[PDB]
Design a protein around this ligand. Structure first.
Ligand SMILES: *[C@H](C)[C@H]1/C(=C/c2[nH]c(/C=C3N=C(/C=C4\NC(=O)C(CC)=C4C)C(C)=C\3CCC(=O)O)c(CCC(=O)O)c2C)NC(=O)[C@@H]1C
Ligand SMILES: *[C@H](C)[C@H]1/C(=C/c2[nH]c(/C=C3N=C(/C=C4\NC(=O)C(CC)=C4C)C(C)=C\3CCC(=O)O)c(CCC(=O)O)c2C)NC(=O)[C@@H]1C
Ligand SMILES: *[C@H](C)[C@H]1/C(=C/c2[nH]c(/C=C3N=C(/C=C4\NC(=O)C(CC)=C4C)C(C)=C\3CCC(=O)O)c(CCC(=O)O)c2C)NC(=O)[C@@H]1C
Ligand SMILES: *[C@H](C)[C@H]1/C(=C/c2[nH]c(/C=C3N=C(/C=C4\NC(=O)C(CC)=C4C)C(C)=C\3CCC(=O)O)c(CCC(=O)O)c2C)NC(=O)[C@@H]1C
Ligand SMILES: *[C@H](C)[C@H]1/C(=C/c2[nH]c(/C=C3N=C(/C=C4\NC(=O)C(CC)=C4C)C(C)=C\3CCC(=O)O)c(CCC(=O)O)c2C)NC(=O)[C@@H]1C
Ligand SMILES: *[C@H](C)[C@H]1/C(=C/c2[nH]c(/C=C3N=C(/C=C4\NC(=O)C(CC)=C4C)C(C)=C\3CCC(=O)O)c(CCC(=O)O)c2C)NC(=O)[C@@H]1C
Ligand SMILES: *[C@H](C)[C@H]1/C(=C/c2[nH]c(/C=C3N=C(/C=C4\NC(=O)C(CC)=C4C)C(C)=C\3CCC(=O)O)c(CCC(=O)O)c2C)NC(=O)[C@@H]1C
Ligand SMILES: *[C@H](C)[C@H]1/C(=C/c2[nH]c(/C=C3N=C(/C=C4\NC(=O)C(CC)=C4C)C(C)=C\3CCC(=O)O)c(CCC(=O)O)c2C)NC(=O)[C@@H]1C
Ligand SMILES: *[C@H](C)[C@H]1/C(=C/c2[nH]c(/C=C3N=C(/C=C4\NC(=O)C(CC)=C4C)C(C)=C\3CCC(=O)O)c(CCC(=O)O)c2C)NC(=O)[C@@H]1C
Lengths: 224, 161, 67, 160, 161, 160, 160, 161, 161, 160
């Protein structure tokens, strides 16, 4: 129960074993899939409808951020000038949302990776590469990976990059094996280069919260 | 989330009834206050950093909280509290515009007590800072709309305490 | 580190997408060296066509000092 | 609601509402009396619209009412008139909200899976709302009908 | 992308001068044509699927393209072509509402010629399809509004061919 | 412009212009002469607005013009009023367009990085536009002042 | 084919075909001769199936062939006989491959949007395939008909 | 990808004809050699690494390629070439099972030549390496199935060169 | 990237021989000059924000480049030019510490000419800005270290030339 | 090199070198003559190290030289001596660079995939470097041996 983070906007908050003992062990085996509540339509769950994995939640779940509009300075149509290029605020809002997905909160002045931002804005790298770079950042290592338990840090990373808690042992053991041999950076790489990531989010799609834990949704929608 | 319009619709939908005279009057009351809500939100939007500035100054600044030993000592934790109150004011504005505190329970107050306890964030010091926001917002915006904002800021306080 | 500037065209086969997809269909992107083998496989398995591959950063036959 | 849409968009960007978004609500707030006028018109003559559009559907599509059909019988036709009464109620919620969210959330998402399970033809329900649109259009003003048609066509468009 | 208003702003911003009398009349000319642009957009929006219906029947249907061996034979490739002509119609409406063909460069013809040659989509047939759109639109909205639409649909054709 | 913003919003959802969005452009087009009138008054009295609000700034914040400050000197005071001339020019583009994008694009995006490099207090530039709002409200009618304030406050909010 | 599916699943895991998967291929290979027999009977009587099921559609749904309908005239009926010839051809490709993939790829993806552009009712084409199933099950042996019905019901299921 | 069954389907789909006598015998020929293609892949899967183990030793090892200065001197380059040849052998087995070389045009030869040219990978050496695979693949499996594999391995060689 | 040591190692690794006396002389040269390389880098890193500020002032500021009509007018374009020269100073420091200019080719000069030509960035104005950086740095670190720094700043100038 | 490792770490965070990072390069460049002395000793008596440590491996693990082993025969023994000569060369490149990156890029990354395809036990290659460390430590001075063995131990650690 301690490995489960609180379903909040930002901050990896885990129940401590030492502080207020509330450890609830349960004999989970390997092929044990956890039932997760989809943010969008109930029909759009991938457990029953695997084809509808890349279907956007229509005012039911989280807002989807996509680089649908043309990036500024893509073609040499707007020659030299054009100071009021309208497609500029859209990509900046995408960047901020891409920052908000990797790191739950908006970062400070001397924390934003300016090199990665301008490469996305120029059209050198896709969103998939940009999300990967923000998760491969030394700041993400310092803030979420290093201060937390290894499998807690894996679980939270999966809830940020895929917007989904892990189904069970099969996925958790996979990333934990990579964490042992290769390291943190390869765990980031594996979660981005996963097929399920590619199906849910394209090359232009910013990740979003897709699935919640029943305990997490209860915290949201069982208040007064 | 649900606004005042959606809350009336949902309540009518649950019963399975068309929008009756009581339901229509609840909508008309919101549309009457709609001009007050939009203008209030624009004032808060313009003076977003200013409210938080004078909230920390009143309650938090020059106390044991700011000084070593306190929670809001380091620049990292100071900017964290600034951000927190920036989030609290923004979500109070959302609830003020909506006319319902459904967004506060869904996105803010959902396991906020458990979060603040685990980190070691003082509840009483945070409440006072939101209480400081209320007095600053009421002095800036007005009497009626400042009262409206004050309800949802109390709702954050009640959910945190 | 050494990187590839690659152009790829990936068409849709499964579903007709009502949104603008031209940016994700025909694109020219820079990929890391260690990631290119996984990226090329991803384009191949999806049913795409690689147009042009060029080594943008670095030089061929780098024994030491490629990172 | 367009108010809900504006807040959600501001929530996702983690910013205060745009002056464009604030003016969008302000225009909706002022033009809320017109929306409540259309809603009351549809509420006032709900039994008239459903009955007229019902008969008009059954003449155009006799197969649904004829023996062997889905809505054959006095109890099955009553369910079909109830179905349209639900859909007309969904429209009135949409007009009031000034957005196509409440119609989608309650009675559009998972309609295709619903009517397939019941054995109801989906195109006949699309026709039923199209008949409901025609009756409602000729019971209110041209400006009132055109505003209402935007929500009606959304019900038709999603089901078709 | 820039509109007719934005182009006036941009041109004045290049010199670094306030909006001069020449640029002032350019704005008022757009506001004079603004009623025509909104009206025509509403007609196209309402009959969006209807325009494409007549366009394919005039040009594409009952040809070698729809027949086996053609590029529009497959039901996926047919549905893509309707979708393509749905884009060409919507973006021409965007360009008409704006009063500038800057949207058609940055969004439509950003890399359309490259992908069409890659997939093997015949350029001659799709240009005729947009030319079929041109005649159907001009018959629907009118001679005055169809003249404006005809320019932008030719601009799509010229950029692609 | 508002017409461009309405296109961008519609293209993001990949849909045609909403009837509400089309009426929003229509309301802008019809009331185009009244909104353009605002730009004329700000253009005609472009000098006396900058001179007065500039003088108001140096009384409200005398530290910036004091020795050791950023605006200290004949040349440094001149470029500050030149900056205020630029910001007013942004407002005139903004009130004509009907959107806050042209103000944002030219002289508001990446403005924090600019003034930090030059060593200019961003809170003092926020006060300079604040005084430019106050002179604008005095030299214009109440309805025009309230319209202009929505664009002025956007410059204030983004600055501080 | 199941050979296509097996390789896809193998390449996704970056491994060779498992003995369990290889057992599926060889069993399909042995059953491929029986699957070719089903196709030969369907292509042998491709004229008689389409014409009978086509006529049966015109008797059940007369409004299709009636003036005002979509398939009215000597040209428009010929296209409907062409369509039914095409969908029967898709079935013959489906039975050979032992998979629903070549049906899905060529002539069962975005069919809902395809006939909507033409204005052809999707319910009527769903009926036409169902009528084609009945003739195919009658002319050809019941054991092979139950095999063939799985591909037919897949078409109807995607249509409705 | 396109299999032998799928290729026969597609070829008849181009003309728009039903599966004729010529198309029927092509399927029957594939169904006759189906057991032969399964057993061949089973032998390959048993000793997949063993083919790659000796093929380098036969052609590439104790040569200028593996010698300092070559493009297979370092461990990283060696592990890359081993991976490449292992993937080359795997996709050839996939082509052997499918009975079509359309997978090879999609899953390997699709942008490998320009990749190898940009990295300064010698085309002559890699072709010789796959040629070294060819006869030993025939030795482990058989004469009939080895000739089948010998076509697809030469198809990779012809595509790279 | 390649430094001075790695370049010596790589040149020894291609031939496959050990570190010879002729290759050792270049190592001794780097180990002697490295005292100047570290000392100057610590000075440049200290005054990094003030070096750029001073250089932009004498070169770019109060000219036609920053004037409306130029490329450094817009606040977005201004912050971009500040960002660029911040990178130009940082990567030149990296090259100065490395003792090789391969890093500049590896990261900076990769797709920089084509980007600058497409956006319409003045080549002459950029060179003069880096030349202004060169003179500020040389006046800060010294004559010998400033010349050594000036090599890489001229290399990045010639690459953009 | 330790210079490059410092640069790439600083570039990843997009910052100038740390006070500690600059001090480490300063400490490396001052002790560069000492690192050159380690190299010159190892390059001078290179053939005596690999011969002794080779023979010390063959007495410890004779299964290598015994039939069935990887290095069976005088030709394959010479290859094993060459392999150790290649690895001693990597250590000499490692000590002058002040980092283990040159050793990694050439003869550590993808070594487990290499010796698998050769059928060489990697733990025996790990033990060969262990013996190479022992002979080299006894060859030159202890103060230089402690620095040399530190890079040797990494090669052992990555191998095993
Ligand atoms: C300021 C009023 C007081 C204060 C604040 C403070 N907060 C943090 C850090 C966090 N704040 C949160 C809480 C939230 N998560 C949510 O989802 C919401 C609603 C949108 C909120 C407000 C979280 C999760 C954290 C953890 C780190 C993070 O930012 O993600 C700190 C720092 C604590 C630390 O040690 O890291 C502080 C100081 N504390 C005071 O002293 C003020 C009275
Ligand atoms: C029908 C018998 C009764 C009923 C059902 C009902 N369920 C939901 C929502 C969900 N159902 C599940 C459960 C499962 N998903 C799984 O993976 C499994 C194990 C195989 C099951 C059974 C989940 C996860 C959800 C949440 C949405 C999602 O699909 O992710 C609802 C909707 C609840 C809501 O308010 O959203 C309903 C109505 N309820 C009844 O009234 C019937 C008695
Ligand atoms: C002097 C160099 C400049 C200056 C200083 C100044 N600071 C404040 C207010 C505060 N300063 C801090 C900052 C810190 N406290 C910490 O714990 C740390 C990290 C170790 C720092 C850097 C804080 C939190 C305060 C609030 C006061 C408090 O501690 O309770 C002021 C007062 C301004 C006000 O009233 O708001 C001043 C004047 N100002 C300058 O202009 C000098 C160049
Ligand atoms: C119809 C006029 C002709 C035709 C159509 C056709 N198109 C494709 C494939 C694509 N079409 C586009 C174009 C766009 N997508 C966009 O995002 C935009 C901008 C808004 C446009 C205009 C692209 C990029 C594709 C790729 C697929 C995708 O989903 O993006 C095809 C090929 C379909 C296939 O995958 O096999 C076809 C056939 N061809 C004709 O015969 C008509 C003359
Ligand atoms: C006055 C309100 C404040 C102030 C002004 C000040 N600015 C500068 C320097 C520059 N100002 C700009 C900025 C702009 N150019 C644009 O295109 C726009 C947007 C339309 C603006 C606002 C630029 C580019 C410069 C550089 C110099 C130049 O004009 O060529 C200075 C000089 C800085 C110095 O010390 O060198 C000053 C003084 N400073 C204050 O204190 C006031 C709050
Ligand atoms: C008969 C079952 C129904 C019917 C027939 C009808 N169809 C059309 C038009 C077309 N039909 C198709 C369909 C396909 N051809 C293909 O290549 C494929 C993929 C294998 C399919 C599914 C197409 C593309 C056309 C266009 C004509 C052409 O081939 O060029 C019509 C004419 C529509 C019109 O009015 O223009 C008709 C009448 N209609 C019915 O009522 C029956 C239920
Ligand atoms: C071995 C026969 C010879 C050899 C191989 C070699 N190749 C590379 C580089 C790469 N190989 C590929 C190729 C592929 N792309 C694909 O999609 C597939 C099929 C799945 C393959 C096989 C790729 C992607 C690369 C790029 C780098 C990477 O490893 O991902 C190298 C490395 C080049 C270098 O010098 O660093 C080598 C050595 N070269 C020889 O000399 C052998 C004779
Ligand atoms: C300042 C010296 C002159 C100037 C600069 C200028 N640059 C840009 C934009 C970009 N410059 C780059 C180049 C780089 N990418 C990198 O990663 C590095 C470091 C290795 C560099 C130097 C790129 C890719 C961008 C971002 C593209 C974007 O703007 O989105 C601009 C803005 C271009 C525009 O008009 O939009 C400018 C102005 N130009 C001048 O006027 C100065 C003389
Ligand atoms: C001695 C420690 C052990 C041993 C030696 C042995 N190795 C091989 C095979 C090769 N090893 C190399 C050498 C390297 N490749 C690299 O990338 C590096 C890093 C710079 C090294 C050290 C090479 C190139 C080969 C292939 C042979 C060739 O030179 O072409 C063999 C040959 C195996 C065979 O039978 O083919 C042998 C004998 N074997 C042991 O058992 C010792 C423990």
């Amino acid at each position: 129960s301690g490995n489960d983070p609180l379903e909040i906007q930002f901050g990896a908050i885990f129940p401590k074993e030492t502080r207020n003992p509330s450890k609830r062990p349960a004999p989970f085996n390997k092929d044990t899939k956890r039932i997760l509540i989809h943010r969008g339509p109930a029909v759009n769950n991938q457990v029953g409808n695997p084809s509808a994995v890349g279907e956007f939640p229509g005012s039911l779940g989280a807002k989807v951020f996509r680089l649908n509009g043309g990036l500024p300075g893509a073609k040499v149509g707007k020659n030299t000038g054009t100071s009021v290029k309208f497609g500029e605020s859209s990509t900046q809002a995408l960047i901020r949302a891409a920052y908000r997905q990797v790191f739950g909160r908006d970062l400070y002045e001397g924390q934003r990776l300016s090199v990665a931002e301008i490469q996305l804005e120029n059209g050198d790298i896709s969103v998939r590469e940009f999300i990967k770079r923000l998760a491969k950042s030394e700041l993400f290592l310092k803030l979420y990976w290093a201060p937390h338990y290894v499998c807690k840090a894996i679980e939270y990373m999966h809830r940020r990059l895929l917007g989904r808690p892990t189904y069970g042992r099969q996925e958790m053991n996979q990333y934990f094996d990579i964490a042992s041999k290769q390291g943190f950076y390869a765990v980031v790489e594996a979660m981005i280069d996963s097929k399920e990531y590619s199906d849910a989010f394209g090359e232009d799609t910013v990740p979003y919260e897709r699935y919640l834990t029943p305990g997490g949704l209860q915290m949201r929608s069982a208040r007064v | 989330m649900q606004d005042a319009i959606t809350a009336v619709i949902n309540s009518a939908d649950v019963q399975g009834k068309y929008l009756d005279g009581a339901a229509m009057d609840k909508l008309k009351s919101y549309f009457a206050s709609g001009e007050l809500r939009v203008r209030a939100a624009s004032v808060i939007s313009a003076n977003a950093a200013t409210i938080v500035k004078e909230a920390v100054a009143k309650s938090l600044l020059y106390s044991d909280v700011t000084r070593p030993g306190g929670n809001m000592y380091t620049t990292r934790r100071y900017a964290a509290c600034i951000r927190d109150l920036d989030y609290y004011l923004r979500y109070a504005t959302y609830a003020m515009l909506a006319g319902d505190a459904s967004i506060l329970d869904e996105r803010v107050l959902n396991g906020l007590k458990e979060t603040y306890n685990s980190l070691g964030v003082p509840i009483s010091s945070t409440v006072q800072a939101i209480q400081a926001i209320k007095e600053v917002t009421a002095s800036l915006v007005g009497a009626d709309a400042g009262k409206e904002m004050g309800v949802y800021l109390d709702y954050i306080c009640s959910g945190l305490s | 580190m050494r990187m590839f500037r690659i152009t790829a065209c990936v068409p849709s086969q499964t579903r007709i997408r009502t949104q603008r997809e031209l940016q994700n269909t025909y694109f020219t992107k820079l990929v890391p060296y260690d990631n290119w083998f996984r990226e090329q496989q991803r384009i191949m398995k999806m049913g795409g066509k690689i147009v042009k591959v060029e080594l943008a950063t670095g030089r061929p036959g780098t024994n030491a000092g490629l990172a | 609601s367009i108010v809900t849409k504006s807040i959600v968009n501001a929530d996702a960007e983690a910013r205060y509402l745009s002056p464009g978004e604030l003016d969008r609500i302000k225009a909706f707030v002022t033009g809320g009396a017109a929306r409540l006028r259309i809603a009351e018109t549809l509420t006032g003559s709900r039994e008239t619209i459903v009955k007229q559009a019902g008969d008009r559907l059954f003449q155009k599509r006799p197969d649904i009412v004829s023996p062997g059909g889905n809505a054959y019988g006095e109890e099955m036709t009553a369910t079909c008139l109830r179905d349209m009464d639900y859909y007309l109620r969904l429209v009135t919620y949409g007009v009031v909200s000034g957005d196509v969210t409440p119609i989608e959330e309650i009675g559009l998402v998972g309609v295709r899976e619903m009517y397939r399970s019941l054995g109801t033809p989906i195109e006949a329900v699309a026709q039923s709302v199209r008949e409901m649109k025609e009756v409602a259009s000729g019971l209110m003003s041209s400006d009132d009908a055109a505003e209402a048609s935007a929500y009606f066509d959304f019900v038709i468009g999603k089901m078709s």
